[PDB]
Amino acid sequence: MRIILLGAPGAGKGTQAQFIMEKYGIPQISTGDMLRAAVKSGSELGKQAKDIMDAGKLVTDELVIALVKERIAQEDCRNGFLLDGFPRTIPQADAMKEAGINVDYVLEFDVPDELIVDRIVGRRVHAPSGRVYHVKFNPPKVEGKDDVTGEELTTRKDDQEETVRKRLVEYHQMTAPLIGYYSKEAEAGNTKYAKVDGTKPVAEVRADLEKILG
Numbered sequence: 497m498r499i500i501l502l503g504a505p506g507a508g509k510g511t512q513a514q515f516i517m518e519k520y521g522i523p524q525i526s527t528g529d530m531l532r533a534a535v536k537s538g539s540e541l542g543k544q545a546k547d548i549m550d551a552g553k554l555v556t557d558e559l560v561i562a563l564v565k566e567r568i569a570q571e572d573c574r575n576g577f578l579l580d581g582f583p584r585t586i587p588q589a590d591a592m593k594e595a596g597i598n599v600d601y602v603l604e605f606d607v608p609d610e611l612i613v614d615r616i617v618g619r620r621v622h623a624p625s626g627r628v629y630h631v632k633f634n635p636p637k638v639e640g641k642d643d644v645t646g647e648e649l650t651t652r653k654d655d656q657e658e659t660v661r662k663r664l665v666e667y668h669q670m671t672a673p674l675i676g677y678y679s680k681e682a683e684a685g686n687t688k689y690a691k692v693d694g695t696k697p698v699a700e701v702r703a704d705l706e707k708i709l710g
């Protein structure tokens with residue numbers, strides 16, 4: 497099974513990607529996670545993203561397409577995968593099509609602009625695994641600690657209000673058009689498309705996704 501998660505920053509994509517990985521046994525391919533990791537390690541493919549992410553801007557289509565292709569070509573993706581935060585532009589989607597990377601489900605997480613900044617204020621992450629928490633809405637079992645490793649959680653460098661604002665503008669300019677794009681793909685019978693209400697509690701969004709996917 498191959499899945500794309502679509503939606504504004506803070507919609508709940510990374511959170512639900514974890515559940516889907518656990519339930520359906522497919523890997524989460526998060527271009528944000530990969531680029532952050534590339535910057536941290538100084539990997540030649542992706543270290544270039546540091547300043548661009550800090551500005552809340554999208555990195556080049558070229559760079560992330562390469563990252564995704566490398567990840568996909570590996571073993572653990574042979575039998576399905578979930579793309580979380582990719583594609584982010586129509587050229588990225590077209591590159592998938594040209595490379596014959598079709599998908600089974602596109603899942604649109606719908607959350608009002610107004611919930612985004614406030615929501616992301618509370619985001620804390622465990623960078624080694626990609627696990628995401630919220631100090632109020634989805635807390636770790638021990639305050640400030642990852643549930644698995646017990647390591648102190650961090651705040652993403654791009655998760656401050658001003659940067660989130662810039663990211664949302666970029667989302668509407670470049671990324672929102674993927675809703676139309678994939679809706680048209682679904683009308684052509686190339687994928688299934690479903691929209692979920694991302695304002696519901698984490699557990700309810702999870703149950704809504706299970707109904708669609710199961």
Ligand SMILES: Nc1ncnc2c1ncn2[C@@H]1O[C@H](COP(=O)(O)OP(=O)(O)O)[C@@H](O)[C@H]1O
Pocket residue numbers: 503504505506507508509510511512615616618619620628629630631633634694695696697698701
């Ligand atoms: N349905 C939800 N209701 C409230 N908070 C949520 C929900 N889903 C995720 N969150 C929290 O809001 C923040 C953004 O969620 P995340 O899954 O990281 O969004 P995205 O990956 O789409 O940017 C995270 O801190 C997360 O813990």
Ligand SMILES: Nc1ncnc2c1ncn2[C@@H]1O[C@H](COP(=O)(O)O)[C@@H](O)[C@H]1O
Pocket residue numbers: 505527528529531548549552553554555556557560580581582583584585588654663
């Ligand atoms: N598919 C992508 N295309 C372009 N830039 C990306 C992509 N994925 C992540 N980024 C960059 O990484 C940041 C964080 O992405 P994310 O973790 O999905 O929120 C974005 O604001 C961009 O700067």
